[PDB]
Amino acid sequence: HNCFCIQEVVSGLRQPVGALHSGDGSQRLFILEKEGYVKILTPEGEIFKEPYLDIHKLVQSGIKGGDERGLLSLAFHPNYKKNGKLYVSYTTHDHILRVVEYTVSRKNPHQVDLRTARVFLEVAELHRKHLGGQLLFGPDGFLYIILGDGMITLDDMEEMDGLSDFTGSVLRLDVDTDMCNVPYSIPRSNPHFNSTNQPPEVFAHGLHDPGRCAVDRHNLTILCSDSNGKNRSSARILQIIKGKDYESEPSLLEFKPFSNGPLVGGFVYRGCQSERLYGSYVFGDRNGNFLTLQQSPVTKQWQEKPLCLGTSGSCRGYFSGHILGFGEDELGEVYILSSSKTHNGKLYKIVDPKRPLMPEECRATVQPAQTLTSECSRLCRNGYCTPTGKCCCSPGWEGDFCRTAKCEPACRHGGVCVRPNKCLCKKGYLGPQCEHH
């Protein structure tokens, strides 16, 4: 038979939202928990006692199920290995969907220091469904953020005033700035770049209730399942070509290739363990029914095909509970994260039993995560530090890395400008500037 196979990796998680890797060589798998935690799974298979990220007090999460409100998504900078930069989305008139950047401990590669929270976006939301929140870097290194309805209606926007124009849209930002005013630059080739009509951040609109959108990096394609609420579920696809400058939005083309009902989301499998699954879009429903969306090269049309699970040895045709999201290895291998109704979150790995667990092609040396050595990370005294390496000085500091203090009128008589507007005077000189004797 041609079935796939699931294998329990980790258990005792608390409501897993999903998992991904950091692209830094350590085959570390970072697991997201809804309450506002990110935990680390070593390639050697240990869940580190200390959480990688613990923001559970900041995040307002669900008090039940169906309540969509926790930590939403995580994304590492394309150059995390050098600049150690994360990007995180989470909930906090009802609530605000925040998108924030964090930077790892300069002393611990396995922990983020929370003092580096640098808010990028704050999206007001009225309801607790159709939130979205998925974050991804396409090639060219732009931050794509995918936002659902928030169940905001047309009339709810003529009533409300101070309310985000982003909900229901794919947003695109250039995070790599040497500027120190705006936390992000609006990209190069965005539609509404200069803008007056429609907000510059919006790259496309039309999303309602999107699942985990499959992301094909090939020059970039994102394929979403969309529940559409009461209406039948569809699939929306967004395509991006070679550095093209847009002045009209790319169309987020809708088509309805699904039959079974709602889907958690999907992925484009590009791991090593499965030969046959290579390049396939795989979508999965809540109860672990799996699909493949294959596009005909000849007709360019789409076709859903089922995908069975089957037990062979301890690698089994079933998992416990229901699927909450999906996972991706550094090696590109693929996971499901499940939970069952307290503290029963599980990580399972999808396996092709026709192939070995460790084929020749799949061997890879793990390069263990390393403390930051980037110039801005070490020298940039205080004030923040942009993913490009620029050090942005907090009021009253100057210098490439802000190490010099600013004293408005200078310190006199050999006095030293220790802090902004603080003079350290030599014995015998009183006064804020050491002016008197």
**Three-state helix/strand/coil letters over the chain:** CCCEEEEEEEEEECCEEEEECCCCCCCCEEEEECCCEEEEECCCCCECCCCCEECCCCCCCCCCCCCCCCEEEEEECCCHHHHCEEEEEEECCCEEEEEEEEEECCCCCCCEEEEEEEEEEEEEECCCCCCEEEEEECHHHCEEEEECCCCCCCHHHHHCCCCCCCCCEEEEEECCCCCCCCCCECCCCCCCCCCCCCCCCEEEECCCCECECEEECCCEEEEEEECCCCCCCEEEEEEECCCCCCCCCCCEEEECCCCCCCCCEEEECCCCCCCCCCCCEEEECCCCCEEEEEECCCCCCEEEEEECECCECCEECCCCCEEEEEEECCCCCEEEEEECCCCCEEEEEEECCCCCCCCHHHCCCCCCCCCCCCHHHHHCCCEEECCCCCEEECCCEECCCCCEECCCCCCCCCCEEEECCEEECCCCCECCCCCEC
Do 29 and 39 contact (CB within 8 A), yes or no? Answer: no
Residue 171 and residue 312 share a domain: yes
Contact by Cβ (8 Å): 362, 347:
no
CA distance 85 to 175: 11
Specify whether 232 is located in the same domain as 287. yes
Residue 216 counted as an annotated binding residue: no
Can you give the C-alpha Rg of the chain in angstroms? Answer: 24
Parallel, antiparallel, or unpaired for β 234-240 and 252-255?
antiparallel
Which residues, at least 6 apart from 197, have a Cβ–Cβ distance to it below 8 Å?
A: none
Structure tokens at 158: 């003529």
CB 118 within 8 A of CB 100: yes
Q: Is residue 82 domain-shared with residue 198, that is, in the same domain?
A: yes
CATH code of residue 361: 2.10.25.10
Domains: count for the chain: 2
CA distance 330 to 196: 41
229-267 burial: b if 16+ Cβ within 10 Å, else e: eeeebbbbbbebeeeeebeebeebeeeebbeeeebbbbb
Paired with 169 in beta bridges are 205
Compute the distance between CA of residue 134 and CA of residue 421 in angstroms, rounded to an integer.
44
Unique residue bearing structure tokens 């169906």 = 66
Contact present, 413 and 422 (Cβ < 8 Å): no
Report the alpha-carbon distance of residue 188 to residue 143 in Å, rounded: 13
What is the rounded distance in angstroms from the CA atom of residue 326 to the CA atom of residue 322? 12
Q: Are 322 and 371 within one domain?
A: no
Q: Which residues contact 285 (CB under 8 A, 6 or more apart)?
A: 260, 261, 262, 263, 264, 323
Experimental method: X-ray
Query: Do 215 and 329 share a domain, yes or no?
Result: yes
Amino acid making up residue 425: C
Q: Which two tokens stand for residue 195?
A: 């803008």
Of 312, 333, 351, which residue is a domain's last? Answer: 351
Resolution of the experimental structure, in angstroms: 3.1
Amino acid at 164: S
- Pair (279, 420) in one structural domain: no
Indicate the residue among 351, 367, 395 that finishes a domain: 351
Q: Assess whether 374 and 272 both reside in one domain.
A: no
Distances (CA, A) of 112 to 5, 66, 104: 35, 30, 4
* Residue where a domain terminates, one of 309, 333, 351: 351
**Is residue 243 located within the same domain as residue 369?**
no
Both 297 and 411 in one domain: the answer is no
Same domain assignment for residues 337 and 372: no
φ, ψ (nearest 5 deg) of residue 82:
-90, -50
Residue 425: domain span = 352-437
Q: Please, which residues bridge with residue 424 across strands?
A: 416
Whether residues 425 and 282 share a domain: the answer is no
Residue 19's beta-bridge partner residues? 31, 327
Q: Are 336 and 250 in the same domain?
A: yes
User: Hey, what are 93's tokens?
Assistant: 């008139």
* The residue type at 267: F
CA 68/CA 390 separation, integer angstroms = 36
- The closest of 269, 274, 317 to 7, measured between CA atoms, is 317
**CA gap 122, 55 in Å, rounded:** 16
Q: After which residues is the chain broken (C to N over 2.5 A)?
A: 92, 218, 341
